[PDB]
Structures are given as C-alpha cells and as structure tokens.
Amino acid sequence: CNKQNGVKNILITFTDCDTQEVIGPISHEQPDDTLPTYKNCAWTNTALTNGYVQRSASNATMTLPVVRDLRVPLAFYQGCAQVDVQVEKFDGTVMTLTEGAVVEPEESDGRSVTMNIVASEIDELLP
Amino acid sequence: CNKQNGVKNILITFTDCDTQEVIGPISHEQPDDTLPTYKNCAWTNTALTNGYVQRSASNATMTLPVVRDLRVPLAFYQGCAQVDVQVEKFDGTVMTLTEGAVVEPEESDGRSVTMNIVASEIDELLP
Amino acid sequence: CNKQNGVKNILITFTDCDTQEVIGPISHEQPDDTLPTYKNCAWTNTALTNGYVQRSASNATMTLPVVRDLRVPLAFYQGCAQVDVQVEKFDGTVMTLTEGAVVEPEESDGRSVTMNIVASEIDELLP
Amino acid sequence: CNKQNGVKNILITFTDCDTQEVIGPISHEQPDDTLPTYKNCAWTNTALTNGYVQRSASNATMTLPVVRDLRVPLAFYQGCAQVDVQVEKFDGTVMTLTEGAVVEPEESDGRSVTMNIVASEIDELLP
Amino acid sequence: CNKQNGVKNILITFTDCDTQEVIGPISHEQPDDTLPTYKNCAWTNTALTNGYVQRSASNATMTLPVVRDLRVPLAFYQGCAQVDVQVEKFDGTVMTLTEGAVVEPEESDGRSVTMNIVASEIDELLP
Amino acid sequence: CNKQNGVKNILITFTDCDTQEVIGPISHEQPDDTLPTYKNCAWTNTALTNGYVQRSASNATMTLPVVRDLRVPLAFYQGCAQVDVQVEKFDGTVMTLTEGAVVEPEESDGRSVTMNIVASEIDELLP
Amino acid sequence: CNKQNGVKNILITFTDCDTQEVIGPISHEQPDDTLPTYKNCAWTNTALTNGYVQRSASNATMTLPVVRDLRVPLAFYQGCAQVDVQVEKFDGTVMTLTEGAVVEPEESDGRSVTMNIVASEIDELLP
Amino acid sequence: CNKQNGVKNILITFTDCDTQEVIGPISHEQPDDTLPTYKNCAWTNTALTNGYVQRSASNATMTLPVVRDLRVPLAFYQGCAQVDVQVEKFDGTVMTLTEGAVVEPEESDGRSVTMNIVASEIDELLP
Amino acid sequence: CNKQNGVKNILITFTDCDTQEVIGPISHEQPDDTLPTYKNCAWTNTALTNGYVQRSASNATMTLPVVRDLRVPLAFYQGCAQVDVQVEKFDGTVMTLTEGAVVEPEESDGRSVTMNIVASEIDELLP
Amino acid sequence: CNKQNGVKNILITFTDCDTQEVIGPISHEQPDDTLPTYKNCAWTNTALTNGYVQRSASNATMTLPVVRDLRVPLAFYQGCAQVDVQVEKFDGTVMTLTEGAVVEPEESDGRSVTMNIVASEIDELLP
Amino acid sequence: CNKQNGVKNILITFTDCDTQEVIGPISHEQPDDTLPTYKNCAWTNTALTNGYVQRSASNATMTLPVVRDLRVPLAFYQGCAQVDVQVEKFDGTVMTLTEGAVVEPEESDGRSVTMNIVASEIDELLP
Amino acid sequence: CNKQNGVKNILITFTDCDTQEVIGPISHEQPDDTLPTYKNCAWTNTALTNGYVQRSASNATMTLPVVRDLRVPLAFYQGCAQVDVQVEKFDGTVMTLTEGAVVEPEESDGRSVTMNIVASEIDELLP
C-alpha cells in the first residue's frame, strides 16, 4: 500500500520542433512490466588510476517506454518533437523532465514506442 | 473490438528500378506474430553534452516482414525493385510509404522475406 | 497439398576448379528443418540520407545446408569445386544456380555441410 | 526543441564567373551528419615569442558539404561559378556568405560535393 | 549459522561533491539475491610473455547494487555525490570504502540502483 | 527507384597512343562500392588574402575504379593507351570524357584497376 | 546399421616438436556427443562482386575434441607437439591428417581437450 | 569528492582588438570529455648534445575547447578578439590567462570551437 | 573409483609481492562444479597459410576458481600477491604452479573468487 | 570455376648478379591473401594543364609477396640476384617478367618476403 | 612476484633554473599503463655504407609520464625547472637521472604530464 | 613439427666499444609475437628508367626485438656496445651477425628493447 514499485501517471507534453505546436499533456500507459529508467546526474564520471575520476559533462538520460496515443502521430515519439515528460511513480516519486529530445529513435510496431530522452536536468519530487 | 494491435492489409506496389514495370498493389500476409516496425521521423537526433542534440538528416526506416507472393519474383523483395508499401493496422492506423528501396537484403527461405525499407517520408492516417 | 513450405529436390552438379571433372547432378537431403536461404538480387542497396540509396554491385548469395553425399569428397562442399545448384521447392519454386563458388567454408562434422554459395545470378521458375 | 545543433536550410545562389548567369537560390541537403565548418575572422594570427602575435590578412573559410542538386551542373560546385551561400542552423544562427569562390575543388562521386569556400567576410545573424 | 554468504548492513554516507553536504550513514537493502562484487587490489596486472606481468596502477572497483532510499535523491547514486560505503557481510567480513565515486552511472528504474564505485583503497576487516 | 546513387554503365573506348588501335566501347563493372569521383571544372582556384583567388588553368580529373576486362591488356589501364570514358549513373547523370590519359598508374592486382584520368573537359548530361 | 553418424576410432600420433619423441598411435574417446569438424579444402574463397571470388591459400582446419589420455601430458594437446590424427567414422569415412599443429590452445579442465588442428592437407578414404 | 579531474568554470572575457569592446566574463561549457591543455612555461627548451639545452623564449600555449555562447559572435573565438580566459578545475586548480590571442583559428561547426590561445604568462592558483 | 573427473586438493601458497610474506599452503574448496582449466604449453601457435604456424612465446595460463579462505585477505586473490598453486585431481593428476601472478582480477562477491593465473611453466605429475 | 581472382603458380628463376648462377624455376606460395600488384606500362604519365600529359620513360613495377623457399638464401629476394618471375593467375592470366631487379629491399621475418621488382617490360598472356 | 614489469617509485627533485629553489624529492604516480621509456647511451650511431656507423655525441633521453603533484606548479614539468628523476622499477631496476631538462614541453590537461627529459647520463642499478 | 615460423634461440654477444669487455653469449627471449626482420643483401638497388637499377653499397640491416636481460645494462642495447647476434629459427634457419652496431637507439621501457642492427654481412645456415 506504500511499497509499490511502479509508475502511475506519465504526462507527456509534445511540442513540434518546427511548428512549435504544443500538444499535451497526454497521459500514457506502459506497454509491459518494464519501468522507465532514469539518470538524474548530468556529469558522467570515468574511471582513472588509483581512485581518481574525470568529471565530464553529459546529459540526464531517461528511457521511457509508453503506449503511443492514437491521437498523437508516431513521429513525435521519435525525435520529431520535443517531449516534456512528467512521470509520477506509485510511491510518490515525481520527476519532471523539460525540453527533452529523443536522440536515438528505434523502430516501433505502431503501439509500443521506447524513447531515449535527453535533457539538461531531471527534477525529482522525492516524497 | 477496437483495441486490436495488428496489421490487416499490406498493399505493396512493386516497380522494377530498371524496366519500370509496375506490379501491384498485391496484398501480403504476415509470416508470424511479429508486426512491422516503423520510424516516421526523417531526422535522427544524436546525444550531446548537457541536453543538446544534433539534428541530422536521415531516412524513414520501415521493417516489413511479409510472406512472399508466389506471383512475384523473390528479387523484388531484396532491392531489385522499388516498393510502394501501404500498411493498414487493425485500429485504423494506415501508413503509406512511397518510392521505398530495400537497402539491406537478407537471405529469405523462399516464403518469408523481411524488408528493411527506406523512404524519404512515411505518411500516417492516424484515425 | 499446395501450401507446403519445404524443399523437394536439391540437384547439385560439382565440377572441380582444377581438374574440371564434372560430378553430378546428385540429389541431396536436408540435415534438419532449416530451409536454404536465397538472395536473387545482385545489387545490394545501402542506406543514405532522406530516402536515397547507393546501388552497389554485389552477388546472389545462397546458403544451402545439405547432407554430404558419401560418394562425393567433403572438399567439394568447401570451395574446392564449383557447384551448380538446382533447388526445387514443394510449391513449384525452382531456382537454378550456375557456376557458384563456396566463399566461406566452415567446419562440417562429416555429414551435414553448410554452403555459402556465391553466383552472379540466381534464376527462379516462379510457378 | 531549442538546443538542436544542426543545419536547416542551405540556400546557395550560383553565378557563373564567365557568363554571369545567376542560378539560385537553391536549397541543399546535407549528405551525412557532418556539419559545415566556418571561420568568420578574416585575420589569421600566428604564434610568436612571449605572447606576441602577427595579425596577417586572410580569408573567411567555409567548408560546406552538400548534396549536389540534379538541376545544377557539378562544375558549379568546384570553382567554375561563384557561390552565395546562406546557411541557417536549427538554433537560429544564420550566416550569409557573398561572392565566395571554391578554391580547392576535390573529387566528388556525383552526389555529395564538399566545397572549400573562400570569401572576404562571413556575416552572422546570432539570434 | 556461521557459513552464510550474504550481506547484512550497507551503511553508505553520501556527500555532495559540490555543496559538501554529508548525508549518512543510511542503511540500504539489496534489491535481489546478487551480492556486491569487490576488488581490493589497486594494481591490475596484465598478461605478458612466458609468465611475466606488467604491474600497472588501477582502482579498487566495487559494484554495489542497493535499493535507493526514498529520503535520498537518485542523483547521489549516479556520480553526483561521493559515497562512503561500509558493507558488513554475514560471516563477519566488513569492508570500508572511503571517498568513492560512481564512474559509470547506468539507468535505474527509480528503486534498484547499481553503483560502479571506484576508490583508491578498499579496507577489509577479515574476521 | 529514382534516388539511387550508383553507376550503371561504364563504356570505355581504349585507343593505343602508338598504334592508334581503337578497342571499345567495352562495358566495365565496379570492383567495390566506391563510386568514380569527378571534377568537371578545368580551372583550379587557390586561396589568397581577404577573399581573393587565383584562377589557374588545370585539368578535369576523373578517378574511375573498374574491373579490368580480360579481353583488354592491363597496360591500357595504366597510361599505355588513351581512354574515352562514358559513365552513366543510375539517376540519369551521364558524363562523357574524351581523349583522357591515365597520369599516375598505380599497381593493380590484375583484376581491379584504378585510373586517375585527366582530360581537358568532362561533359555532363544532367537529366 | 549403415547410417550411423559418429566417430569410431581417433588414432593420434603425438611427436614433440623439440625432442622429436614420437608417442602414438593412441586411441582416444570423445568427451560428449559433439563430433569433430573438418575442412579439407586448403583454399579459402572470399566473396567479391557479381559472383567473383578470390582463391586465397589457407589451411585444412580440423577441430577434434577428445578425452585426454592419462599416459600423455596435457601439453601435447595444446601446441607443444605435432599431432598425426587419424579419425575413422562409423560410416567408413577415414581422414588421415599428418604433421598437424594445434594453433589456438584453449584451457582444458584436465580431461576434455579441444584441438584446433591445422595441416596442409586432410586426406579422406570416402568409402 | 576531491580527486575529480575535470573543469568546473570557464570564465572568458572577450575584448575586440579593434573596437576595444569588453564582452564578459561569460561562463562556457565543454563540448566533450576532452579537457583544456596548458603550458605554463614561457621558455621552450630544445635538445642539444650530451645533456645541454637551448633556453629559447616562447609562449604559454593554452588549447581551450568550449561550446560557443550564442550571445557571442563566432569570430571572437577565432582571433578577432582578445580572450581573458579563467579556468577553474574541479580539484581547485585555477589558471588565469590575460590578454591571450587565438593564433591558429580552425573551422568550427558553429557550436564547438577550439581555441589555440597564446599569452605571455599563465598564472596558477595551485590549491 | 578410478574414473572421477574432479579436483581433490588445491594447496595455494600466497606471498605478498611487496612485503614478501609467505602465507600458505592453504587448502581451498571449489565454489561450484566447474573445474580449473589449464594450459601447460608456453608457446601459443597461430594459424598461417597451407599448414604453417608461427611458434610464439606465451604463458601457461591457469584459471582456478576457489572459495576464498576467510583467513586470507581478498586482495591476495586479485594480483596483490604471488600464488603458488598445487592442484591434485581425483585421478592422480597433480600440477604444481610456481610464482604465478593473477593478471586480470575480476570482481568477486567476497566468497567465490576466480583467478586467471599466469606462470612461465605448469608442471604435471601425470600418474 | 572461371571467376577466381587469385594466383596459382609463381615460378621464379633466380640468377646471382655476380656469379651468374641460375637457380630456378622454383614455385612459390603466397604468405597471405594479398595478390601481387603489377604495372605493365613502362611510360609513366604526369598531370599537366588542361588535359595535357608528359609521357616520361619509367619501369614496369611488380610487387610480388611470396613465401621464401628454404632452399634459396634470403639474400636473393632482396636485390642480391636477378629474378625471372612467371606468375599465372587462376583465370588464365600469365605474365612473364624477365631480368627483374629488386630495387627497394625491405626487412623480412625470414619466411614472408615482399619484392618490389623492376623490369623493362612485363608480358601478359591475356587468355 | 619477481617478474613484474612496472614502476614502483618515481622520486623527482625539482629545482627552479632561476631561483634555484630545490623542491623534492616528491613521489609521483603513473597516469596510465604506459611505462617510462629510457635511453642510457649518450652516443647515437647513424647508419652508413657496408656496416660502418658514425658515433655522434647525443643525450640520454628519458620520457617520463607522471601525474602532476598538486603541491607543485605545472610549469616545473614543462622546462621551467631542472628535474632530478629517480625511477625504481618493480624488478629492482633503479635509474637515477641528474640535472635533467624538459626539452619539448607539450600541453598537459592539468593532471597527466609527459616529460621528455634530457641529461648527459642515466645511471642504472641493474639488480 | 617442421613448418613452425618462429625464433628459438637468440644468442647475443655484447662487447663494449670502449672497454672491449666481451659479455656473452646470452640467450634472449622475444617480448611479443613479432619476429626479427632481416636483410642479408648489402647492396641496395634503386629504381631507374626502363628497368635499369643503380647498385649502391649499403648495410645488412637486422631489426631484433628482444627482452633485455637483467644481467646486462640497458645501454648495451642502444649503441653503447657492439652486438654479435646469432638467431636460430624453428625451421633450422640460423643467421650469424658479427660486429653489429645499433644505429638508431629508440626509447625502451626497461624490459623490451628493439635493436636496429647494422653489419657488413649477415650469414645464413639455410638448412
């Protein structure tokens, strides 16, 4: 009742990079039991000798598999439009992503798409 | 009755790149339960630092596995002829592909072919 | 009775590349349920930007796994001799390959060989 | 949606150096993911002792790889005609080059040309 | 009762690399049956000829999969903060890691994170 | 079907510089996926200060890699005879080269030769 | 009774490359149901354009997994000694290999070794 | 937490060599994981016989790759303006460069520029 | 009773490479059913044309997975100390390894370590 | 069977330049898959302005990599003796070279030598 | 345990060429697996005809890549100060270099410097 | 067993050019799989017009990479002493070099040295 590891709402606000047409927020449903993966830290460390690391700038990757909404063209899930993802988990965790961009669009069978979203920062409510 | 994830008709119009002989449209049947994958967006983004991406021009890939029609030579499914694919799913989604070209022909056992179609754009009816 | 996906006769005519000794045609039996794969088109397209492709010349690959005939030395199935393969499927499809050459000979346990045949063209009866 | 590193329009206006026939502007497409390189400064400094430099006059080099337009002869991309390049990037950056001249024409396979353009100045919109 | 191969307490003390805010120690729970892997030796040998090796300096890698604590932001598990890990196994083995740094942050579904910790030395109680 | 970047026919007419024996036209096949490079402009510009160039007379270089025809001696591909190359691409582009001369003959393994052809002008059909 | 695909006798004659001590022939037993793979042809063809191949000289590889004989040191199965393998299958096929050399010795658990034997020629009785 | 090899702030103060318009300081972001290289010593020794060297006066080179700020024209990164670079690394190292001058401007794709800065001296905080 | 393929005693004598503290011999237990792999030959042959090989000097690799002894620090199993391994199998085979060195230390969960030992020679009792 | 790009026999007749001792013909084997390169034309053209060339006298270079025959001293492959090379390819092409001279002897590991042969003319059978 | 190819201690004593301030000895750590290269001989021979050489005086070059110590300014590693390097390898080899001078200072990213040290002589302990 | 391309013994006899102290012969081990290159001919031909060559006197270069013997100072491998190299390969080839001289000493990491030996003649046993 308090210890449920799962997503509850995926509110995505699409905006076309060219026409700047804001479509959203539109709730989405997961296609399977796999949960969206996150990476909040924007600095990717690398391994060096004797415990040293190289703090290099990187992105806040977010892999969000969702069922494509029939009202939304499939192109918007594959880099053709910016995504403003707002995922709230069952345990209260809410992470708002703003001005994301699908970097590596992979083939989708028309219903279940998988986004590899990239943004400068990923917020977190942390209940 | 409204929530069926599957293809209904695959109307492909083959035209030989050399002789310009238009053969089609010819309905095709799926060889298994795997559905055709799509990628409508023609711009493939790439991951860069701190949320930036590089909008690079690319193609609208479409992987369409179909049962080869006995009336059509197998060469037409392996780059020897342009394909005009018109796939209509069970939920009303219809995506017309025009002037495609099989880029990476793989070996087919004579019945089940798998096309990796490449076109400048993939339309979508989006019911 | 008309919709059987399988091979019926594999008539291979071996000729030694050096001695020019034509041995064949000799019917062959499949070692398992895997069917011979084909690629009739001799031009392998490659993916480029926004729907363009590069028509490059290539070969008509044919992967034919057969049970090695005890009357034929195993070397003939591994590039030591040209193969003239003539495969007729159960649905009437007959594809004649002439002057092939096994390009990548892999190890065979003495009974089941797998040829990766390469020829300039693969004909097709197409019933 | 605002942080896309890529070109959007490449409007080139060719004019033959001899006949003074102005052909253009004609939008061009990039052949790959490599972006056009620029050098706005027309004074190339050189390294000297203890922090001093020699301000020497030079050109505003611009390396612009584009897909050759079928309506335009390939000679115009290889020094035979002046180019008036007008590149607008995805982030609003627009740089107008006037009266350029391809200085080092390299071999092109007929589709993808690479110009090494030289002009006295390269403007910049700088959004 | 003495021969139990498993972890008992994972006391991690996070400190932000930027703000130097020390949060911890906070006990953590394993997400599955996989145990944390260790490598105490900071010199990674390499294979050479006839039994010789090249003693090269390296790090004391420690792969620690833990359930992310809801009180701690997920960024701290992905390189955004130094980790002071103190793992005590069931058989008395206690290994204190100080001033570690997650080098390769991978995507986590919000509950189960996997750290690839790097430190100059890994102590060991060795009961 | 219209956007194929590749060569279709390479009709070369060899004539011996000494005996004036015209052998050709003889169609040739490409040895790999690399396409013939061209340079139609016969004036090679050079970079000077502040946007100026030096229009200097040069040649219309054409690098044409072809499979040597067994009926033709290999010497004819290495400067021993004038070449009249007539390459027609898949997109309709046809460029006729007359009275060329291989300037830098490089070693060929007996099958795949690479000509560095030099002529005063390279025509272009430009469909 | 005539159609048994399996090995019957593996008579290997080891001779040390240094001391020239000929130990053998010693019959060997297979460790599992996997049969020795062979490749009699000493010329490995490679795929080229439009049906052409490059006849390149190679070896007659033979992968022979056998149970190591307790009377023979394990080093002899891992390149330390030449092997004269003489395998006779159940269907009468007998292939004599002379002056072989294990090229890639892999780790063996002390009982089941796997040799990757290389020889200039592999004979065949071919009943 | 103390052993991070990376840059934190790159405060560059541009001033136009002609108009003397001081623009800055403006923080910059690295385009990749490559760190700015430095050379503090202004005397470049040269190798001579038997351990002797020739102390010759030189510059304090600094190669600083940064993401070009959209508010700043690209010319300022390519010698058109003096740069006052102030780089502070993650380990406390801060090196102030004053009155630098980009000596060898190379082509930049509009976002990621690479400066080869030359100054009489490079200071160092050395924590 | 005579045909048991398994290890009986693994007597390892650790000596620290730095302090030269000889700890051992200490019997070890296998963590699973996988047996230690060996390679006695110190010359690794490589495949060449038509049956020739290149005798190149190499090491006598030995992969020994053992349960780490609680009295021994885990670092000694990961290159921090030389190992003198003495494995006696159930069938009488005893192979003494002297002055080994773990070359590629991999992560161990604290109980089951896997050594990739390298030594100039591996002896063998060969009952 | 007719389209094999490879060498079959390399009959080289060595004669010492000093002692005039004719040793040969001795068949040679290729050390790898690289084929001998040829250049039959003895006149090397050079590029000039507007399609003109300078017919300059040169040699008929032939790069022939062969496995050194143990009966022949290695010096004969490195300029110490004249070579009379007679290479016959698999497709019938036979090119006889007479009174050649290795001009640039490079280091050979004792087995695989590479000759850069120079002769006034290279004949060709041209089947 | 005796056959470890690697460095153990790099004791460098810096002294400023101008102020004569002796800072050191300060132990240094290698930044990667590359070992310091040496050249003890101070006479560099040159190749002449028929086995003769020209004994010419030169230096004892030593390329020593080390991690720059935070207590030492980076200028001292780039010719601004004399270095007294004392490297002791793992196998007992200790080579003392006195009054060296970095001749060719290259750019360092602030942590890993590479010195090209030049001295009249390089001693060697040679255990 | 007879076709092993590799070295077996490298007996080098060092003698100091100054003190005339003969140290050797001392067997050496190869550091990797690269074999010593040789050039027996002492006359280096050069390419001239129409098949003529210029017989010019040169040296018998021998590149011998060996593991430096700990009993021998590293200077002896870098021109400080004459080398009397005696390499015997696995196939019986033995080449004695007398009064050699390392001409171009390159940096060695203390274990693996590479000599560029020059002598008036290189003998050969030629089994």
Author numbering:
A (entry chain I), B (entry chain I), C (entry chain I), D (entry chain I), E (entry chain I), F (entry chain I), ...: 3 to 129
Paper quotes:
The contractile tail of Agrobacterium tumefaciens bacteriophage Milano is flexible and bent to varying degrees, which sets it apart from other contractile tail-like systems. A contractile sheath and rigid tube assembly is a widespread apparatus used by bacteriophages, tailocins, and the bacterial type VI secretion system to penetrate cell membranes. In this mechanism, contraction of an external sheath powers the motion of an inner tube through the membrane.
The structures of individual tail tube subunits in the extended and contracted states could be superimposed with an RMSD of ~0.7 Å between 127 pruned Cα atoms. This analysis shows that the overall structure of individual subunits and the tube as a whole are indeed the same in the extended and contracted states, as had previously been assumed. In the contracted tail, the tube no longer interacts with the sheath, and the tube’s surface charges repel each other and straighten the tube.
